[PDB]
Amino acid sequence: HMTIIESNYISVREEYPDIDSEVRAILLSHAQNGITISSIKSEYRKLTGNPFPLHDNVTDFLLTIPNVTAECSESGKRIFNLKASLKNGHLLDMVL
Amino acid sequence: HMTIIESNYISVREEYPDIDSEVRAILLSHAQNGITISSIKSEYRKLTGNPFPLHDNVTDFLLTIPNVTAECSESGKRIFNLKA
Secondary structure, eight states, rough: OOOOOOOOOOOOOSSTTTHHHHHHHHHHHTTTTTTHHHHHHHHHHHSSSSOOOOOSHHHHHTSSSSTEEEEEHHHTTTTEEOOOOOSSSSOOOOOO | OOOOOOOOOOHHHSSSSTHHHHHHHHHHTTTTTOOOOOHHHHHHHHHHHHHHHHHSHHHHHHHTTTEEEEEEESSSEEEEEEEE
């Protein structure tokens, strides 16, 4: 009845090569209290000049980016955030 | 192409009145590591005897339950839990 064209996530990330890091910057900047989808979108526009290229199932797309967390607030608002990546251990060779 | 029926979450919670309490229970017993959608479904079958009533976009439904968290792991695996 109603018809929707869904996005291929790889095509999105090829056409918009910076989208993951662009999202990470927006998330991390709101580390204290997190951020909703509407605010991710309008801030994406401010940083790129482009509309956020995902129109349906933004939650699923955002959760295809590693270390992205989402949570349902008590009021039912959906709050997104970025966790710190702890997996890589960094070696440092020191001289004299 | 591919047609589907959009699930009404009020209908679900009326046909399965204990579903929220059941998901939270499953999450409560997997607090230390979190749990994926596959394990939630098959754990739900174990506890209730019924198949999990939602089939597509379970993430969205799970995240309409207060206090439920979802994180994308480094592998891409999707982990669900409670804020605790």
